[model samples]
Structures are given as C-alpha cells and as structure tokens.
Target chain A: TPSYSLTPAEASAVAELTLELAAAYGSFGDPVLLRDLPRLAARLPEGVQDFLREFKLADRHGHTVIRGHDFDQRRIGPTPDHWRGRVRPGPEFPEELLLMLYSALLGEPFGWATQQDGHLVHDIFPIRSHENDQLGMGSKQLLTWHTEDAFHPYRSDYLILGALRNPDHVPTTVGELDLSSLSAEDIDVLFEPRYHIAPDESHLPKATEEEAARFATIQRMIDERPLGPLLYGSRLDPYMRLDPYFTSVPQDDTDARRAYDALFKVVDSGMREVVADQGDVLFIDNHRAVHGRLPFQARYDGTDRWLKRVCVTSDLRRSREMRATSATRLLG
Target chain B: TPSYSLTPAEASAVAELTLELAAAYGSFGDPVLLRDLPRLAARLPEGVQDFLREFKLADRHGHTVIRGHDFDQRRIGPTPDHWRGRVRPGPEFPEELLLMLYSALLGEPFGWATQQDGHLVHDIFPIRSKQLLTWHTEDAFHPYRSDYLILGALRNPDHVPTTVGELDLSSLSAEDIDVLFEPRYHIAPDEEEAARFATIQRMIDERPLGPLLYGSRLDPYMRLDPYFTSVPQDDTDARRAYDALFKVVDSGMREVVADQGDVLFIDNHRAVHGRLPFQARYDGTDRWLKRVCVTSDLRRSREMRATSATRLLG
Candidate 1:
C-alpha cells in the first residue's frame, strides 16, 4: 500500500487552507513558512497523515501517491523551451505551493546548486530540442531509473512530483531490488565499497569557461571522496545507492560486476509503473526507490505533459558548509 | 506632488484586484508574476500610475505616502521576536498584497542577503532589547544597495512613526561636500547583521572605500551609517567636513506617522531611515508592518538571478 488518494471533500479542504496560507505568506522558501507549515498540515485530513506515515516507513512500494489534489490546467501557461528564462511559466500554478506544503509533511525542501540552477521548484517538461537526449527534459529516450543524485552523500530522503497537466498520461518508472529475493551470498557481495560513481550530467558544468572551471573543481572533489558501498548500513535492513548511468565496478572485479548485473536485473523486474494525473502527487523514497520515465513523443505545440518537481531532506543542517547561509537551502 | 492617497472607491477596487492577483500567483516573489507585472501595471488606474511616476523620480522629500487604502486588520497576526520562524502574519491584508502590487510599479522587489534572513518581505516590530534601529541606508555596507525601501503598516495602534532624513547637498559648502566625497571615511560593516551575509566579512577585511557621499556633485547619492562611519584620525579637515555633513543629516530628520493600510516608499540613495524606540506590548496585536526592498533596474542584478526567483538573493 504505497499509494493514497484524497477524497473530493478532503482535497477541497486542503486546497482552501493552502490558498489562505499562500495568500498570507506572499512568498515561498522562507524559513518562517517552513516552521509554520505543520500548523497547516495538522489541518489536513487524517487520511493524509496516515498516508505520510506509511511512506515514511518505506513499506511495500517505497512510494505513495496522493490523488485528487489536482490543479486547474487552464490557468497553467505554455511550457517553456529551456529551464532558464525570465518568463518560465509554471510558478503561477497553485500546485507548486501545494507541492511544497505536501513535501513539508515528509521533510524539508532543498535545491542543488548544480542542478536546475538552485531553484527550490524544478520544472519537468519535454524540450523539442532535447527530445532524444538523456535529460529529464528529453522525451524520445527512456529516462533510465536511478536514485536521485546517487553520487551525493547528502541526497534527499524523498523526491516529490506534482502533476500539473499530464495530458498524455505517461508513466514514471520506479523500482527497488527485493532483498528477500536475493541469495545471502549475493547480498553480501553488494556490501563492499568497490563502486565508482561519477556526478550526473545535470551537475556537470557547460555554457562558459568559468562554469567549466567550477565543474572541474567540483568533479575533482567528488572524485577524491571515498568510494561508498553500493549496499551498506543495517545488516537486517540495509540501504542502497546505485545509478546505472554513472556507476561502475572496479577494474578486473568480475565478481562485483556479476553481482551488480544480477541485482540490476532483479530491480528492473521489480519495477512498478505509476501515472501521475492532474492533481496527483508521487512521493518516491530516494533511499529505497529508483525512478525513470517512459519514452513518448513530445508535441512542442504548447501541449506537452508538464509536472512540477521538488526535492526534500529530513535534515538540512547536514550540509551546512555547502550552503552559503543559514537561510539558504541550496547545496553546492 | 510626491505623495498621493487613494479615494475610498479606488482603494477598494485596487485592493480587491490585488487580492485576486495574489490568489492567482499564490506568492509575491514568483518570476512569472514579476515578468507579467508590466502587463498588470498597464491596467492600474491612471491616478495610481501618475503617483508612481512622481515617486520614481524621487521628488524633494525623497519619499511618498499612500493613505486611505485600509485593510481588514483582524486578519493580521502577531509579530515575531526574530525575523525567522512561524509564518508571522499579514500578507492577507489586501493592503499588504497591494504593497507588492504598488512596488511592482516602481521596480522589482528584492531581499537583502543579510537582512530578515533573506526574506523578500521583512518585519519591523519591536523585539526584547532591540527596540530602536540605528540610522542608515538599507545595506549600507553593500555595493548594490536597494533603490527603494517600501513599508506598509498593517497595525499601528500607538501611531509610532518611522524617522527619515534627506541629504541636502546644498546645505554643505561645495568645498566641504568634495572633501566628504574623498573616499577617506570607512563605514564599518554592520557586524550585528553580518552573519546573514556570507560576503560581509570578506568585504570588511578588504576595507573598501566608504565615502559618505558619491555620484554627481549637484545631485549626489548618499551612503552613510552615521554611528558606523569614521574618518582618518589625523585629517582635521576631513573630520570637520564629516561633522558638518552629519549635522545637516541629523537636523533634517523628521517622522512620518503611518496608520493601518498606510504605505511609504523612500528613495534609499537620497535619504536615511530609522524608527523611534517604543515600549513593547508583546501582545498579538502590537504595531506591525510589512516591508520590502526594491531596485528600479532589474538588469543590474542579472548575475545574481536564479531562474523563477522573485525574492532576489545574492
């Protein structure tokens, strides 16, 4: 039972309270709002709280879906061509503020300095130019399932997405390797810290010479950090971090690669597909779940499926040094 | 000519429209709303537009006040002791939203990297020990000082006022004004709020020139935190010029009282502002006001811009 949906009555109530608070605060990303969100969360239906409880436990599917909290699609303007611009359209959607309120139910929201330009709210829409590329904005190629920011030590505990206008009803893929299905010997092999994972392309720099220099510096620092175990922590309930796009086994370690390939297949077989319709929000437990997207043709004619995204961490102080100030939630 | 007040009918219509806009956007600092503000401004009542035109030029008093735009004060909550924590009240006040809407007329609203924890909307209520604030330009230590300081009073039961003083380049002898502009004075960085700014310590260590005044001699821009500014110890002439300039600023000080729904916007480069110390009631309904800093030129902060960011933070 990794999914839940709000009743029409409940959704209406939640929407009303959120609208009032948003009208009161006038801005987002303020620590004051962060502190005060629980008051509003307490006002949500008990069923919503029950759903959050289950997701926090990372039961069965390692994710939860809250349906029926949809936004008015007519109000949402045309999707943009690039993530950068003065007129990026989706912030006007009330669902973005609602998304933050919901993410508050689980943890604090944060942004990555190297990803999405350090914006707390990130946009996910197909760019006609990146249709066949590997980025989230690409539509033609399959977005390979991976833990969000698997290479970072301070990655979020959860990744939330609120559907604004998913007209195509495309499915987002998610999976977690079933530990119970693996042999004791196979599980033990994965516990070793022999994996080399590079930072994702989203974090890599381009555009200008200065950006390139920063990329080189960050890349060197990431490389120097010790190799982390692919599967480590509690012996009974070990956590996992794996990314097919950036992860690799040590050279000449056929045994590690063999185990890696085996687990990868198990995860793929265990994958579950979920469709986020308008007003539906999907909370993926980043520690226990890896997610991807289905390939689809993007109609650049201002009618592509659009969704708003936000990343959440339970504890923000863990990356204090990476942040520029106490109020800053972006991790460099 | 600088100050203007809305008629009861005009205030009601503007307030209603702004509330609807705030409801639609959900937040004041959205890049989309900021981009679309020009379109929205075009629809403002001609009288409102006329008032904005005068304020943008920073007429004689270097400030303007808008009255008669009252809000439902019952909706506003208590002021927080500190800038951070627990969504302390009052954006629901149509007047508060109207403040942002009005701010859109002059420039884009921004937040200080070191003030009110980088919140675009700041609180100016009394705290335990810090009732009175020192006289200074907002972000006096920073190079990119705000162009306008906007404040909207949602609760002013006692009618306590914000004190302001304008620079009169005419009062000082030309020779004295020139000596004051020699970059010989050092305006010490505001270390109390320094923790909020990541670059303040670095800037202070660099000890950049802190001239009391700069820009065109006839209509020069002033940047001084009287309590924090200093001159070379041995330069008698510089000290005398500094003394003369301080007197002109101090003597020009006047208080502008604000009531509920009253809004004030000051030209930061032309004047300095502070508040008179008042006893704290600690009641939920104590004097409360919503404040925002604005810059007329958005392009000046292009490098600091983040995508979809309305509350600009460096």
Candidate 2:
C-alpha cells in the first residue's frame, strides 16, 4: 500500500481552504462544521475532489495513499500521549481541521462510543503507558493487523490516517489476502459465519455506573454475534471482518478453526508497510484491507510519529438510530 | 412530598422560554445545547432560576416537584419503551428543553454510555414484560453516578406515582453509620443486563467497592439499590446493620404523583427512586415522563471525552 502525495501547490491550496473554513465555523469539531460540511466540501481544491471521488468509487489497491499536503510541524506542539475528554482547541487545529475536511469528502465521520472515549476525531501517537499494549495508542507493541472494530456491524468503511509528523518515519502496516490466496473450501466456510470477534481493548467501558452498565449490556449483545460471517457478499468483490487479536473460531468446529488459521497465514504473508510523512494522508478501505503498525520506540522529547485518524462512512444515515443527534457522529 | 404548582402566568413564561430556546438550539439532547446551556439558561424566568437555586442549595425534602409547565399532551405522542439511538425531534420538545435548563441550574446534564443508547435525555414509561423497577440510585454499580435525577411529566393519564425513599443520616447512630460506610455490601448489576457478566457473584464483587453511605457527615450521600445490592449473608452483624438502614429508609419513603406538565428533580446523592406498582395500559396514553441526569462536576470524566464540545463520552 502506497499513499498519494499532494503536490506542493495542491497542499498549499488545501491549507488555505481549511483555514478559511475554520475561521468561518469557529472550530474544527464544531457542530455547525458538521452541519455545513456538504455545503463547505465543494470549496476544496478541484483536483482533491476528483481524487476523493475516484478513490471512493473503486481503488485497485487496498488503500489510496495521499501526499503533498503541507503540514507545518512547528505549528503542532508535542505529540499527545492520549486523546481525552472534550476535544479542546489545540495547536494542531489546522492539521486536525484538514483531516476532517478530507474525511468529509469521502463520507461522514463518526466515532465509536467504546473506542478512544467516543471521540469522532482520534489522535494516534505513542502513549507511554500503552507502549506494550496492542491498541492504536500503543508505541512499542505491534498493532496487530485487523479490520478496525471488526466486532461491530457498523465499523468504519474507510480508515483515514493523516500524518502531522513521522519523525522516525515508522511504517504503518497493512495486509490483504486476495481470492487467489484461499481455497474454495476455505472461502465457503469463511462466508458461513463461523467466527466470534470480541470487542477490542480500545472500547473501554465507561467509568460511570450507568454508562458502565450500558457498556456491559451492549458489549454482551455484540459478543452474542460472535459466529457471524467472516466474509460476505460476492466472492469476486467480497468484504471481510477479522481481528487477529480478537477473532476466534468455535472450539468444537475443528475445520473452521483450521480455515481460520490458514487465513491468518495468508494475511501474514501478504503484509505490506507504508510510511506516511508530514502532510501525507493514507486512506485504507477498511473492509478490503487489514491494517496495523510496527513497534517503534517513543522519543518522548515532544517529537514522535503522529497521525490524525478519522473513521468515514459512505452512508451517514445508516446508523441514524445509533447517533444521539443529527450533529452527533459518535456511535456507541 | 408535595409539589409546587406553577401559576398560570409562570407556566406561560416557562413554555415561552423553552420554545424560544428550542427554536435557536433545536432540541434538549443536542450536544450543542449542552455546550450553549449556560447562555440559554439565562433566558429562563428569574423566579424559576431562583427556585432552582434554592432547591439545589438548601432543600432537605429529598425532592422538589414543580407542577404546571404547559405541554400539549395530544401533540407529545404515545409513550416509548425506551429512549435511545438518534433522538427524534418531538412535539414536547419545549418541555424537554426546559427540563435540561432546570437541570443546568443544579449541575451539568449527562447520560450513561450504555443506557438508552447514551442519549442525554431518557424516557420512563410502561412496556410489556418489563420487570418492575426497584429502589436504587441511578448508578450504584459504577464509581461515579448522577448528582441529580430530573423527570418532567409529558403525559400521565393513569396518574402513576413515582416513589422516593430517603435515609435520615443524622438520626442513625455513629456505629451503624460507620458500618454503613464500610465496603461489606456487594452491589449486583441489573438482572436484565446481568447475563453480560460470567457469574452473579462475580458481577457483584467485580464492581467498585462503596459503602451504602458516605460523603460529608453533615451532608452524606447514600448508595444502595436494594433489588440489585446485597450484604454478605454469612456476616450477620453487617447484614443486621444493612437491615436497620433499610428499615429507616423505608419508613421515610414518600410518593409524589406527578400530573401532566409537572417536573420532579431528585437529589440522587441523598435519595433513591422507585415506581409504585400500577397496572399499565401500554396504550398511547400511558404514563410518560421525559428524564435527564445531571452531574455537578462536568470535568470529572475528562479522560472519557473525544471532543470538548460534545458530552457523549464513552
């Protein structure tokens, strides 16, 4: 997987447009910003609009790597250890704003109430405490390749990662096991709903009692659908949901377990890495590609590889029932 | 246990203020509404604001019930089984918005990440096969819960009463109060949602430990959900203490039958709420109340937020 680099001129235009919109809307994550996204989307550079439409319609590669967006590294302060609570205005407002704008072009942005404190816009930087963990916020551990939030039916259709800075140029990992890699028998079983995907650690329960209870109940509901199909739709252009760290085949079903192991090997063999530099954005078709990151040491010196991540959905209204309001994009 | 009925003029002013706020902010549960609440709250009638301040600051009655904030019962529609997912704009939008404003006077409005799909606003009404609600604080299983529980009646054709029980902490002897503050009781999760846990006892033991009562001795907070909480059976002394506390709480129980257009705000920290068993029609005209939970400190869960503008943090 490679990213599309923005031409210097193209990147300049995007920055200008983002600032103009930010000035008008007051802030990047402003509710009014979401309300007026479609009206504001057309204001993007013509070339960028075309690229978004083309990539979304069909991309041969599992992801479309975008480059040439210039992000001023000095303007962004130290890399954050974690994205917590009400998204306060930050120095990276320009880059953060740009990510949201680019994400809106492809589709509506959303957050999982269980992941990263239900933030619609997520920050991906190495957290000191989470260095040994397998979550997105972890630095030292390999973020195992998997479709993001594979346990949920409404997982992100596209995973957008826009780089603010990659001081060490650490590579983000990706994998895709095509039809050619699997046997017909394996494909049949994979499509037969033979796996249970547990909710990942990222979806931590709420600290409050009421919220915790609700988190537990909804979690139980998702856990009940563990044996759902791992693969679906047409065999030629199929969709997949699998988390190597969280997915499991029923113990009694030996054949299913073998198929699962076989698929893991295929995925592992097909793995690729793409480094996103400053001003570069990598858009991974989540259903088609399983993505992760390699273990990298954190400098903790206010400089580390940092990316602004947003989950984009093509049909915003599909989860209308799950959203708290029309402006709310986070789904619990 | 008695309610203060709003004067005709006062009711009219409240309705206007809510409608005006809704016109500008859309609905009560919108994230923007929560963000802009401080400014919009000023638009509330001066008398109402004063009432809220007094009730929150000095009321010792466990609850402050207000009657008469006009709502078009016919326009509000039928009762809902639950309030979750995308909150639909409804006919009682004004009343709902008003409830949020009143709640703001006491504290910041919030919702459970798991309850009613995490919508800040919730509904309480009758549904088939639903277990009768038992006495409890809104969230005793978790470490932090709501500071106040606000409920506004949109429809109550059956006049179904909301029962509240409180403990007189000052009257309890020092020994019993000390025992009540010990972590000897195990609080269980709701039965309907308990299957999520591996075992019933694990579900109880794994939760955050808290005494039935704690906080300032002069203004102690009670945390007990009888149907979902239990004292160790083998610990006879602890069990006797819990029984004694329950007896005092039950003896102080009072019922408030909210009529249409009435609002009831419970000091959740000091009071427990339950519903009186009544035959529910499950028809369009069943008891319907719009509910919202409030937390005094909005920044307590800052780590849970993705953005500062929205309150729906997991």
Candidate 3:
C-alpha cells in the first residue's frame, strides 16, 4: 500500500470529503438511489475511509497491470432497466447502477461532479490471453514512462489504478521525484523560459492552424529560435509534466541539462514499484506523484497482460464551474 | 463546431488514427464481435478525417456545467458482461474510453504528437468552449497563461473526470486584468528572453526556445493571457477565452500604475505580459497571479462557499 503521507490540511480534506461521499452512497444498491435526481444526493460522513479496498491485478504470464473496469454502463444510467447500456446495456441494469457496483467492487465512490459530464470509470483487469497486446501509438517497444497527455491545456489531476491479476511476477514501478528533493535553484532552472524540449520525431506532426497559432504564441517566449520557455507554474493543479529522456536543454546554457540530470538521478534511484497481486488499487495523487511503466515480454499467442486505468478529480462541489452546456456531462 | 484545420501531414495522421479507433469500436455493441476469441481483430483504414461534429446545444450557451451530483460512480466504472473463463478486470473504462470519446466527441480527432517523455499524447481539441466559460484556476489573475502537469516534470495525467463537465459561465470575464501584472518585473529577468520577442509590430519572430519547444512545451502563444505578444495569429483558436471587458496598461517608465490614461490604449493581444528584473526588492510590491478556485455549486449554499472561497495560493 502506498502511504498517503497526509499533511494536516490534506488529511482533513480527505477525511471530510470521503465521509460525505460514502453517506451519499449509503443506500447505493437501491433502484431509486442510482437515479440522477437532484433531490437524491450522494453524501458520506466524517472519518469514513473505505473509498477503495484493494485495486491490484496480475497478468496471465505473471505481471501486474492492475484490476477493475467501469461497472456495466447499462447497469446504472438514468434509463429504465429495460435497455442495456454499453457495459451491460439493458433493463435489469441501467447505467446508474454501474456507479454503485464500481463503488462497491473497486471502492472509488464519487458521483459525476458535473451533470454535463460522464463517469468513464475504468480498470486494468489482467487477462490470461494477451490478444490485445498491441504496442502503444508511440511505436516504442512498450509503453514508456512519460506523464500521459502532458501537452493538453486541461490535464487530469488524479490517476487511480488497481491490479486484478499478474501471473508471471513482472513488476509495475513508479519513479517518484518528490518536490522536496529539488532546491529552489532546481525549481528556478526548471522554470526558465528558454529550454527547447525536443520530443521524438514520432511525436511531431504538421499541426493544424490552431496548433500552429498556439505554438507560435509559445515561441514568442524565447530568442530567435522560436523555442518555448523552459518552465511555467500551473494555475490549478500542483503536478508538472515533462520528459527528461526526451526534453532538451538550450545549447547556450547548462541549466536545463543539469536540472534534468539531477531530477533524473533522484527519480532513477528513488523509484517505487507496486508489484502487487489481485485486489490492489493504487490511488495515485497525480499532483504529487510521477509514474512510469516497466517492460515485460509477451509471446504474441494468448498470454499477454494488460492493466485497466481509471481517473477521478476532486472539487466536486465546484463541478458546475467545469461542465459545458448542451451536453449532460463535462468534456475533457 | 471546432475546426480541425490541419496541415497535410497532420490531416493524414488524424485520418489514419480515426479509422483505427472507429473500427476498434465498431463491434463494441455486439458481444460476439467483442469476444471473437482474440483471433479476429478490427482493422482501420490507412487514411481518416479529423473528428469534428456539431451539436444542437452550441447556440444556447457559450458555457455548460455537469454536476457530479447528477450521476453515480457505477456509470463511471462498470464490469464486463460476458467473460468465458474467470474475468480479470480489464483496462480502466473511464480514462481510456473517455479520452477516445472526447477525441471523437469534441470532433477535433487528430491524436496529438508525443510530448516530453513518451508518457503523454499531445492532442488538441480547441475552441470548443468560449473562454468566458472555461475552468480558470491560479493565483491572482494576470496576463500570462501556461499549462502544467500535462507536460512538465510532475506529470500525473490520468482519467480525471469519469466524464468531463463544462461550467456554464466563466467565474470572471477573460482578460480582466489584476492591474498587478503591468508593474511586476522578474527578480532575475532573462534579458535574453526579452530580446527574442519582437516588438508588437513584428507578429512572428524567432523565439529563444526554438519553434519545436514553444507549442509542445510552454504553449507560449496561448491567448488565455490578456497581453499576449502579438495580435491573435490568423489561424488561431477563437480568442473568446482571452477577450476582456476592459483594458489596463503600465503607468510609465516606472511601470507603476495600472491605468493607461489617455493615449496608451494598448490592446491586450499587442503588449505581451512579462516582467524584467526588478532586483531583490521583495518589498511586498512584487507581482504575482492571485488565484481563487470556487466550486460553483458551493455558491448554491453560502455556507459551503464561505470557508474556502477566497483561500490564496502563489
């Protein structure tokens, strides 16, 4: 179990929110409870701690991906129990029911913060037959360790995964470079607006006009080269996303390089692997943690391993500030 | 609807990936097709078009909000229906499915280039919502905009909202200056960085970090800020997010006051916002973006809004 090393404030916030959330789901299994009626609210109480029990998984060949997936979508939506939704889209199971099922099965119980948004709760259940062991779009030998979707303006803040199966004993590691390790100087160097991080060509493209415009705007921060500023602080989320292996420092100075080297060394040395068996969900604090994947061989036949992934964000009370109109749910 | 407006290559990649993704989900509704014993795999065409679609709701409001109170967690993470052997949990449906869904839904379907390390996929679905209604969080409002977490050192990208909801309206109007940005100078200003930016006249110039890092790394040109370096470029997302109700500029050579007086009506897009070295004068006069993140629903109940409404963070 990864320690949630809580600060007084964080501890209080979690305690408060979880309790409210659980109570909100008290009568979770009832048909009427799953309905998205404003009158029927979801609230837990103080000191309620069972958001999740275990979220780990094992691959057939003996590796860990994590377990859990969305409950049947059809099992819990607002629709009557006559038609099955995607997950189990029919009457006996409305999509609304899936939310409670997952809350019980996977342990993460929170309603959609925004009505305009949806609940894409998912898990990485281990599979005995690695039929879908396709390489990631990156074309890398395997899924590398860069932060996911670092380029998007609105990034995900929480990534919780649970392993359902891992047979061969392959380990799933997370390289964490805690903020305390970096001095203000390191932070400053990393924040410099002159580092021209060059991603692999496989990552580059002939972008759209909007993209070009976005890039052009960023290019103004640097010298004649049109490079982007090295670092910028996030307004909302605390976590930062960048690739040391792929990010490049400016040629004139050694700051970006030195900064990368220092952070890399610490990450390489201070890595943590959540190599757990069935029943373990790694609730990662995206704001505080940096994660990566390790390689495992999969003989193409029927023994490939896979992990299910799920994400949740707090500030639920503020969800109205995030949802778009028209759509009943929020758009990412 | 937001336009794809892609380059030849970008269009190609988006087309290629779209075929792949759609085909993959073509049989999603049918169990037999889904359970073909792993032998039969769905295939996509080599070329595809960017995913863009218009919705009936676009004209109603520039913003939207989806309250979590509306739906439960099960719709978020459901289990598979039929598994022959014992069914181990599969991939997270919320994260994986939603990202793809948004890619298709927002209709701007070209999955982006890879970023930093291989962890992120740099995709862009822009101009979907007006800036006035987007989720804006940070310290004091200023004329500077940049994204963190998604592409920086502390990467924690995950399936965030089981469903991403949009706020109905922006908490504050875009480009509403804090008046502080005009005066704050970088303690250790990067004179080199300043030199790279062309005067307001030269819309596009050679930036320091090189063209490659600009969009992918800093998004320097993001117009979310009021005083961007140049006029909104020709092929940019709609500037609604950065549009403002009023204007403010540096006072004088001292860069002290916030009002532009008589003739200094500087366009927010013309005068970029940044600070030159102001020395170690930490005399509480330094500049910073003060942020306030308020959950709209909390406002429904004043008590809920009272405790954490104006908490400040630098």
Q: DockQ: which candidate is best?
A: 3
B-chain TM-score for every candidate = 0.86, 0.85, 0.23
Pitting candidate 2 against candidate 3, the one with the higher TM-score is 2
Using lDDT as the measure, which candidate wins? 2
Model 2 Cα displacement at A36 (Å)?
1.6
Residue-level lDDT of model 2, residues A1-332, one tens digit each, is 43455677877888888767656666645655665454355566666766665565443456877787877777677787567743476777777777787776666677876666666678888778877777677888867678887886567878889889887888988787677888889888888867887875555342553344335434665656647778764455466787877777889998898888888888888888888877788888887789988888888666888888999875443344344443456765
TM-scores for candidates 1 onward, in order: 0.49, 0.49, 0.38
How is the predicted docking of candidate 2 categorized under the CAPRI scheme?
A: incorrect
Candidate 1 vs. true structure, TM-score = 0.49
List runs of model 1 lying over 4 Å from the truth.
A29-31, A58-60, A80-83, A86-91, A202-225, B1-314
Off by over 4 Å in 3: A1-142, A198-238, A299-306, A312-332, B1-310
Q: Whose lDDT is higher: candidate 1's or candidate 3's?
A: 1
Q: What TM-score would you give candidate 3 relative to the actual structure?
A: 0.38
Give the per-residue lDDT of model 2 (tens digit) for B124-234: 777676676567787776544677899988888878888888878765777777677677888765542343233333523475545787643334568878877777678
How far off is residue A181 in model 1, in Å?
1.9
Question: How far out, in Å, is residue A58 in model 2?
Answer: 1.3
Worst 10 residues of 1 chain B by lDDT: B299-308
